[model samples]
Target: GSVSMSGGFLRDDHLEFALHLHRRLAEAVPDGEVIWSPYSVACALGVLAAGARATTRTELTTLLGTDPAPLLAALDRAVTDSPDLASRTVLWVSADVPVRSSFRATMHDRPDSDVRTADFRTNPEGVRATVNADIADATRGMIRELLPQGAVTPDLRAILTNALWAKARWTTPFEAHLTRAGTFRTPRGPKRVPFMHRTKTMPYATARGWRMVTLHAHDELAVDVLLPPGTNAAAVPTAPLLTALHRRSASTSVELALPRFELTQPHQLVEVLAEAGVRTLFTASADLSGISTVPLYVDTVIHQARLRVDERGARTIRFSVDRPFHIVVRRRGAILFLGSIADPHDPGPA
Candidate 1:
């Protein structure tokens, strides 16, 4: 059996949404390290879209660039068949809110979903602790305390959560002895960091704006690194550019040098989603009647992720990533993680 979504449009829908979200995130921190799982975000938002109605539903689907139901099903299928991927999507509603039967049935139908109720009105802290516990366990402790203190206020009505953990080996692991320090152009200035160098014939492409090199890992996982024409990270790749690059990409001899870097951070997407024309859900005019009888509105969306590109399989190639660049981790055509690295030495962004 092939390792891909059964739906025909799944690939384009996933990539387009991934690239669009990446562009938005890049604009927020043009010169800082940022990483989040677009697949996970889509999974969480897909569930939210189920309960959304009127303009609220349209905005969620529009922002995602597609309906999330098939996306979620396809991702669940991928996880079930792939050994390296473990993901969980959960929806937590306040105990007082009466969830719609149709909404609860839809969530329970998914293979990798969890639906629960918490006391948001009285024990918000307990709810936060429980959510963080599930997140920590799902991410294998890589992401802890996703909901910081006071994040789950009493006014909260519901919280949608998703987390992913991927451990795949490089198709051809880098020789450890070849690793050495190299200068990387960070947002602040130049700094030296350990760079993993290798030479291989992989999918390589060059276009009008960016240069791309794909590094394949085991279990149908790959990282496509994109470097802009110049050092400035402002001009990230557009969907059209990416599609063209893919069409033109071919196996070519490449000399690759990528930094051995690890990034761990949480991305708050409430503002980013609003900026991308998804505002009604966060406003009083919200409509979530499909999910609950009580009047409710989304307050925030939190996504935390960790990615380490070392000499091992879960990691990178030379078309020299010596400057600021973008990373896309995908399984087949599904984008699992999307990020931009500005400073490899610095831990992560604020």
Candidate 2:
């Protein structure tokens, strides 16, 4: 039952790809300056999987995992803010290609995705600029050009593009006065950057290979930072590290020091996917027959993402308890809701 891809069930493919690409990108991109949305890329691939058959489909299922629920649940809770966290997919199909109705339906069927077609055979460069423009808009200018020159050549019948952009402002926005220019660690060693500071109860934890810290978008909405010993989080094995990371949430007090930085990265995920055992997808003899009667194969997959993280300010929170102190509910403040009949009948704080 656990392995079943039941209706709306969770899938582990995103997990596998996330771990895979994180490690690969850590090595490929300079230091840990890269961040990509596994959800966006995997969701795009999942749609492609729906239109695949035979070995191609089998291979995709292998990478994306049969379970989809867990990851979807994760995204539902995690993508709390649409503006702060934006991820989208776009498909540019050649107008001449005969596409299956099922393919079109499935493309848009995936949540927050849309499908568009153009004559890639005609103005390939024009198609390139138009695609680039659309993606740039989607990522809020973080990614200006996804399909570059010669990328949408004549052989390109269809192009699959996706991008992820995120900007997390601390729940307690760091006041400008506290932001001081200082030398902080970078790929090349200490570099001058504005640093933000706070002494507050934030999620903090220590585990092997990494120290976990949570940065709130604004209170409950948050982003976790796994500060690795090295610049890249991929420096360690993913499974155990993630397990330990989950163990470190809730609240802890610390002097929060963060460097203000903004980053934008354009990743060519085709080669990354290829190295991760999705080789058959780009082959000429690919089995995307379910996608179109015109015999379509994936010419390229472009993924771009951007992130900006800094502090704004802070506040002291006093909890207004709404629920009980059950193990699953809280896993704190409970006198069993009683001052105990045996003791003074002081029905505490009504």
Candidate 3:
């Protein structure tokens, strides 16, 4: 019913690298937003990877687990296999769960066709359910193919799910009326592009050395703006925005206007996280000695995500986070966690 408190050392270099990568990936998403949440659940899994006891949150938090070097190695292998996986938003949680018994109960009497069990463990319970459901809803079924139904168990004490979502529009807006051939300037060179246009003066500002714009939805849910490619971009950190969005209890109204234009970018979420110093979490050698377990070890981790853009009257962008992810702590049942990233990118430039 409640999440437990746990602590562990996260390398500053790894965290910073992940943040930088996240920012670069974010730039690729036009009219979109990204979200990430890491907690005790994530740490527990890290500890398990180090082959230590990780039953209670306290025990999991105390061990000086190994560096995230191993997990990073695995992530690098994954990135090599699929590039798109790099430019997505990721959320990872780690927690405690009863091991061997749970695994047997969950995977009992299953055929290779009905279910394929992997060796890795350190999965959580409520967190996995919550994360999978979130992803199913966010993508509107586009990404369900990757995540088989009932792939995760619901009876575990703890679980951790790392999720990443990325969405971008086509280079040309689908609406013929809104598309116009024009010059689009890029660092490489100016080229003709079918630019999508919507002329309207929304809230505008030139503050903190950056241009700002805002966009509003029919329902009044608005997106605030912190323009990119400006000196202030570094000042407007993404971590703070992510924290504010997740912790806030309510939304506030604001005045703003925005011009519609076509933007396109292909990105990878893993690269972004690496840039943000979140490198440790991805490494196989990550230390997560918090969760209670015997001979803790993280077997494997999986990630999947998708995004789409719809232009029916008002632009509708949708994304999903559905990946096959499980972590097994030696002698403990596998903890599964899943989630999707869904937040509107409606704020105009400021």
The C-alpha lDDT values of all candidates are: 0.76, 0.57, 0.30
lDDT of 3: 0.30
The residue-by-residue lDDT of candidate 1 on 243-348, one tens digit each, is 7776667788888888887776777788888888789988879999988888988777778767777777441234888888888787645677777888785332
Question: Comparing 2 and 3 by lDDT, which wins?
Answer: 2
Clashes of each: 8, 15, 98
Q: Write the per-residue lDDT of candidate 2 for residues 1-350, one digit (tens) a residue.
A: 55422112112344455666666665565443455566666667777887888888887778877533333344444344344555668777887887788878776555556778877777888888888888778767877887678777866777888876665545577666776665554444445555666667876656674565655554234455555544442253364565465555557676765555444556777787888778788887779987888667887788775555555421443221111100000001100000000001111111
lDDT (Cα, tens digit) per residue for candidate 3, span 1-350? 55413111123333333344345644545523333312212332333333332232223232223343343332322223222222222222233333454333322221110112222243434344445555445435433332344444433222233343323222222354654445433333444443334444444433333333333322212223344333322233343333232233122232211222222122223344344333444344443343223333332333443322233223211111011111100001111111111222222221
lDDT ranking, best first: 1, 2, 3
lDDT computed for candidate 2: 0.57
Using lDDT as the measure, name the better of candidate 1 and candidate 3. 1
Candidate 3 regions with alpha-carbon error over 4 angstroms: 1-176, 218-292, 297-310, 313-350
lDDT score for residue 147 of model 1: 82
Looking at model 1, the pairs that clash are 169-313, 170-313, 255-318, 256-317, 256-318, 256-319, 257-317, 257-318
Q: Which model scores highest in lDDT?
A: 1
